[PDB]
Design a protein around this ligand. Structure first.
Ligand code: CLA
Ligand code: CLA
Ligand code: CLA
Ligand code: CLA
Ligand code: CLA
Ligand code: LMG
Ligand code: KC2
Ligand code: II0
Ligand code: II0
Ligand code: IHT
Ligand code: IHT
Ligand code: 8CT
Lengths: 185, 50, 177, 49, 99, 170, 35
């Protein structure tokens, strides 16, 4: 798994925190490794679980950010009748009573049972890498060098989407406005 | 070499001044209760509507 | 020569790697003064009770036999609703198995005379542990869940007593104070 | 009195001692019993303790 | 001769046949695959992991009665106040008069 | 020969000078009568209590938690001895102090250093040199906070003015 | 009244259980002619 940009991004000789050195778990092989782990979470918890959690959070939060934006730009027909005008976290409470969120929980949990099995199997030497669920129907990750880059994009956009979703939700708590309405203020 | 075995040996011991044994386990408390209540009721007890 | 769980304290001499739950934590040092086989058996037995007890708190609380005195969610107050008759015939069922599993040997001076390892009543229908590594990881998992479920039934029960609300209900209502 | 309760047990509390104290005594007796040679014998009584 | 007793009777025979059936299903197959192993997130270098799998530690220490007397000793003679007994090496028995 | 802190007095014998913040100050001479390690542990524990108390005294005055009512620090003890929390805090302190007793028994046999509990959760003073400087800083700040907590509380009693208030208006 | 009842039940059960499991503990062997 050669690292794209090894030397400028995600590789040795690029250590983020200049004064401090990184934990011994943070080797030069992992993706998006800028040598950043001040609180030292890596020595305690296995890196495979940690990258699984990072990729799961990033993939969930990219969907969450794009949902919070698209829900403002457009809405599926009929949601405005059942759900009244209802933004990020109020819509959660309304949709829980509606029962849609139960279905989301049921089916995402059904998928996460096999996600749990995959995490277990990787942690007992199945050879699977973190976040690799074999999902590439369009065959866009076939080329290896493009896959390398797309991995760091996935990590970095996941991080950016995590911070973004935190922003949108707490801006909603402040003003009670969505992303599009909040930016035009 | 077990606590119950030692207890049974002590109860069935021929070395106690007064033998207890398993029948004594039932006799001594019952007889002592009867003696105590009889003494207390004989020295002091209100009249009884026989 | 210092306990891992209690850095400040020195390691209990008895506590050791061989046990499978050892992290050096015996600050009192009971180990020094009781059969550690007996202590481990007691730990695993209490935990095996509590592991079922917490789920019971939870399942009884949501589903229940449709029998007439069997339906009362607050478990604390449920023990008495179902008749002691039933609770006694179950207590007697656990007695049978106590003596069945322990094979009559059920005192500290007799329990392990047959060579039975502590905490094993020879039960292993599934999740086989013939793999020592698997046995080694599963025993730590069992001990951690035993220890956690102890805290659990404790909280669930004392808490159900505190607010007369079963587990799931209490927190959702979470009437505080 | 004269009500017909089984073993006089009118309160359910009374059962806790009545069932448990034999069980603790049974547990203490089991340590004795498990230590004995429990094979059969052809005699009027067992001379092995 | 009731419909529900028949139902309970089928389930009783199910519970009775479960152990002879599934215990043997376990016996023949089992999890002796040499890959069935529990997996956890924390690094296994320091999980307080069990060593030697089942471990039974031979025991020849104080009797159970003596043990409960030790535990009774927590209230009868705890180790608290002994810290404030005088300096036990020599108390400066040769404390120089100047000091 | 003679303590630098008290030049007219002679240097207390057991106070050789190894422990942090040791300036040979023991006029009454408790070190000669008792183990210095036990006294050092008592000093560190009381001083840590006092440092937390001194910080909390001011943090309560500037900010009392919204779920709790607003009372000056001293007026609070009496409130929470009934609210319930008082019990919870003193309960947990006793829980930790039982293992403190175990650690003291270790200390008596010399298996543990005085005032040491391996608490560097974030590896602050992991440098040998720094741990020294920190040990000196810890003992001084503790010795100061012992005075500060007593002043704060005793001032409230003589003058109903949370320190911040009093300082504002004498 | 109930407290006295349960205390008496405790005492009676204790002594009856001692009698029961004591005579059940191979009492026939406790004779001077054994072995
Ligand atoms: C949980 C979300 C949700 C809810 C509550 C509803 C609810 C409703 N939809 Mg539906 N709808 C949804 C998602 C949802 N829709 C999705 C994902 C699609 C697929 C694109 C549709 C497609 C759809 C169509 C095509 C129509 C509705 C219509 C309606 C309303 C009649 C009804 C109240 C009807 C309506 O009233 O439209 C105005 C209608 O014509 N829905
Ligand atoms: C309801 C069913 C369900 C189930 C069984 C699981 C199962 C799992 N989730 Mg979760 N998850 C679910 C729904 C569910 N999820 C939903 C609907 C979402 C919202 C999108 C998430 C979002 C989510 C994230 C973001 C993460 C998990 C993670 C995990 C794993 C860690 C479990 C753990 O250690 O818990 C321990 C806690 C005990 C109380 C496991 C595969 C984590 C993971 O994979 O870590 C590597 C992780 O990062 N889940
Ligand atoms: C129904 C009859 C029955 C029988 C025959 C036994 C038999 C036994 N139980 Mg008990 N047990 C029972 C019911 C029974 N149990 C029930 C219903 C439960 C609840 C699920 C338990 C839960 C349980 C646990 C968790 C433990 C035992 C233990 C024991 C052993 C010693 C108990 C002893 O000497 O207590 C005499 C002493 C006391 C009764 C003290 C009680 C107060 C404490 C100190 C607080 C023995 C194998 C212990 C064991 O195996 O030791 C390693 C043990 O740890 N049992
Ligand atoms: C040194 C001992 C000490 C003692 C005896 C108390 C006692 C009290 N504090 Mg606390 N407090 C302490 C330290 C102490 N505090 C420290 C170090 C801080 C700084 C963070 C605070 C900050 C603080 C606040 C902001 C408030 C209290 C309040 C209280 C009351 C309820 C407990 C609570 O909410 O604590 C919460 C405090 C903490 C979790 C921080 C302590 C953590 C360290 C590790 C101990 C009670 C009178 C409340 C009060 O007076 O309500 C009327 C209140 O609003 N305390
Ligand atoms: C995880 C363990 C634990 C548990 C189960 C509790 C339970 C409780 N604490 Mg808390 N508490 C804890 C840890 C814990 N505490 C710790 C570590 C401290 C510091 C030593 C405190 C200090 C504390 C205070 C100061 C108060 C509580 C209070 C409470 C109550 C909160 C429930 C409520 O009203 O909402 C309840 C009795 C409150 C209480 O007693 O309300 C009556 C309260 O005022 N707790
Ligand atoms: C012997 C032949 C005489 C026949 C006795 C009748 C036998 C009936 C037994 C049931 C008694 C009963 O239900 O109690 C019922 C009564 C007391 O029950 C009364 O019940 C009333 C309503 O039913 C009220 O509740 C009263 O409060 C309550 O006292 O029992 C007694 O009188 C006390 C029992 C004393 C037993 C003495 C112990 C004997 C010593 C050895 C025992 C043998 C152990 C063998 C072990 C195997
Ligand atoms: C796993 C444990 C367990 C076992 C192995 C077991 C076996 C048997 C057998 C087998 C030989 C018989 C024949 C039998 C019979 C009865 N059982 Mg029992 N039973 C167990 C558990 C419970 C529970 C939880 C309850 C219960 C009850 C009753 C009643 C009610 C009589 C009444 O009250 O009219 C009767 C007649 C209920 C009760 O007594 O209360 C309503 C009750 O709640 N049982 N039970
Ligand atoms: C053994 C074995 C087998 C098996 C098996 C089986 C059936 C195993 C079953 C195991 C079970 C049921 C385990 C349950 C554990 C529960 C825990 C740790 C709960 C913790 C709760 C906590 C900390 C809490 C809390 C709370 C409290 C107190 C307050 C509340 O307000 C909130 C909250 C609710 C959060 C098989 C058959 C495969 C065969 C094999 O050969 C051997
Ligand atoms: C001269 C001399 C010597 C000496 C000496 C000296 C000067 C000794 C001085 C010792 C002193 C000043 C000790 C002070 C201890 C204070 C503590 C433990 C405070 C705890 C506070 C708590 C728990 C609290 C609280 C609270 C807070 C904060 C928030 C409130 O809402 C609630 C509440 C009120 C409960 C030496 C050493 C040489 C010996 C020599 O021979 C003679
Ligand atoms: C739906 C719902 C609810 C809800 C809710 C939810 C889901 C709430 C919360 C959501 C999320 C996504 C929170 C994210 C918070 C992120 C933070 C604070 C980022 C910090 C960044 C830092 C420190 C930056 C660090 C740094 C960066 C990047 C750059 C510089 C270096 C460094 C310092 C390392 C409720 C609770 C209202 C209930 C309701 O009934 C239902
Ligand atoms: C009563 C009570 C409570 C309480 C309480 C509490 C928390 C009480 C706390 C009291 C404290 C901590 C008092 C401290 C006094 C310190 C003194 C006198 C130091 C003098 C040092 C000097 C002169 C140093 C001298 C010096 C020396 C030696 C060396 C250097 C030179 C020099 C500086 C000159 C409540 C609030 C909980 C309510 C409850 O209902 C009951
Ligand atoms: C009363 C009642 C009601 C209804 C049924 C019935 C009548 C039979 C009766 C039954 C009562 C029963 C079953 C009671 C059982 C009591 C139980 C399970 C109590 C549990 C108590 C548990 C407690 C404290 C746990 C506290 C643990 C603590 C701090 C641990 C601290 C810690 C330790 C030890 C090491 C690591 C650090 C950490 C985590 C801080």
């Amino acid at each position: 798994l050669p690292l794209y940009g090894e030397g400028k991004l995600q590789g040795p000789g690029t250590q983020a925190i200049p004064g401090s050195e990184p934990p011994p778990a943070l080797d030069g092989t992992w993706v998006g490794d800028v040598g950043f782990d001040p609180l030292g979470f890596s020595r305690v918890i296995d890196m495979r679980w940690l990258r699984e959690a990072e990729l799961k959070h990033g993939r969930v939060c990219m969907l969450a950010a794009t949902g919070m934006i698209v829900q403002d730009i457009a809405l599926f027909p009929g949601v405005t009748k059942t759900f009244g005008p209802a933004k990020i976290t109020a819509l959660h409470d309304v949709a829980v009573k509606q029962g849609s969120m139960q279905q989301l929980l049921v089916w995402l949990g059904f998928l996460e049972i096999f996600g749990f099995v995959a995490i277990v199997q990787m942690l007992q030497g199945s050879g699977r890498q973190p976040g690799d669920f074999g999902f590439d129907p369009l065959n866009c990750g076939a080329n290896t060098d493009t896959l390398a880059r797309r991995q760091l994009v996935e990590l970095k956009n996941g991080r950016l989407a995590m911070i973004a979703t935190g922003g949108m939700i707490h801006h909603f708590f402040l003003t009670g406005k969505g992303p599009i309405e909040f930016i035009t203020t | 070499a077990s606590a119950w075995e030692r207890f049974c040996s002590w109860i069935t011991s021929t070395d106690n001044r007064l033998y207890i044994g398993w029948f004594g386990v039932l006799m001594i408390p019952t007889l002592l209760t009867a003696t105590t209540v009889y003494i207390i009721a004989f020295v002091a007890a209100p009249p009884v509507d026989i | 020569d210092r306990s891992y769980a209690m850095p400040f304290l020195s390691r209990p001499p008895a506590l050791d790697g061989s046990m499978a739950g050892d992290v050096g934590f015996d600050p009192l040092g009971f180990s020094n003064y009781f059969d550690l086989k007996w202590l481990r058996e007691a730990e695993l037995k209490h935990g095996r009770v509590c592991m079922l007890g917490c789920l019971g708190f939870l399942v009884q609380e949501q589903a229940n036999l449709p029998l007439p005195g069997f339906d009362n969610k607050l478990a604390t107050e449920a023990f008495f609703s179902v008749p002691a008759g039933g609770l006694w015939q179950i207590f007697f069922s656990l007695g049978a198995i106590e003596i069945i599993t322990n094979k009559g040997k059920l005192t500290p001076g007799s329990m392990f005379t047959g060579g039975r390892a502590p905490g094993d009543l020879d039960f292993d229908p599934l999740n086989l542990s013939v793999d020592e590594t698997a046995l080694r990881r599963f025993e730590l998992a069992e001990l951690k869940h035993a220890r956690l479920a102890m805290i659990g039934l404790g909280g669930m029960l004392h808490q159900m007593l505190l607010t007369k609300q079963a587990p799931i209900e209490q927190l959702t209502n979470f009437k505080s104070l | 009195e004269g009500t017909g309760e089984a073993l006089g047990i009118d309160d359910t509390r009374l059962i806790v001692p009545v069932i448990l104290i034999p069980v603790i005594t049974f547990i203490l007796y089991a340590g004795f019993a498990s230590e004995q040679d429990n094979e059969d014998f052809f005699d009027t009584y067992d001379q092995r303790r | 001769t009731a419909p529900i007793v028949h139902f309970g009777s089928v389930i009783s025979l199910w519970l009775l046949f479960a152990l002879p059936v599934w215990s043997a299903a376990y016996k023949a197959a089992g999890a002796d695959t040499a890959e069935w192993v529990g997996v956890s997130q924390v690094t296994e270098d320091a999980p307080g992991i069990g060593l030697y799998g089942k471990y039974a530690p031979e025991y020849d220490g104080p009797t159970f009665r003596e043990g409960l007397e030790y535990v009774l000793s927590f209230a009868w003679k705890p180790p608290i106040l002994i810290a404030w007994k005088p300096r036990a090496d020599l108390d400066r028995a040769m404390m120089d008069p100047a000091r | 020969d003679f303590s630098a802190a008290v030049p007219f007095l002679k240097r207390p014998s057991n106070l050789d000078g190894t422990l942090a913040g040791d300036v040979g100050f023991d006029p009454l001479g408790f070190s000669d009568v008792f183990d210095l390690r036990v006294l050092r542990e008592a000093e560190l524990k009381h001083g840590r209590f006092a440092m937390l108390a001194v910080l909390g005294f001011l943090v309560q005055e500037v900010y009392t938690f919204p779920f709790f009512p607003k009372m000056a620090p001293v007026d609070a003890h009496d409130y929470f001895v009934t609210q319930g929390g008082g019990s919870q805090i003193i309960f947990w302190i006793s829980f930790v102090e039982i293992f403190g007793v175990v650690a003291l028994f270790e200390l008596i046999q010399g298996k543990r250093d005085a005032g040491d509990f391996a608490f560097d959760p974030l590896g602050l003073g992991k440098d040998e040199a720094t741990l020294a400087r920190y040990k000196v800083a810890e003992i001084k700040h503790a010795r100061l906070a012992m005075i500060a907590i007593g002043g704060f509380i005793h001032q409230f009693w003589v003058t109903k003015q949370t320190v911040l208030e009093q300082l504002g208006n004498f | 009244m109930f407290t006295l009842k349960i205390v008496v039940y405790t005492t009676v059960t204790f002594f009856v259980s001692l009698f029961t499991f004591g005579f059940l503990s191979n009492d026939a062997s406790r004779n001077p002619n054994r072995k």
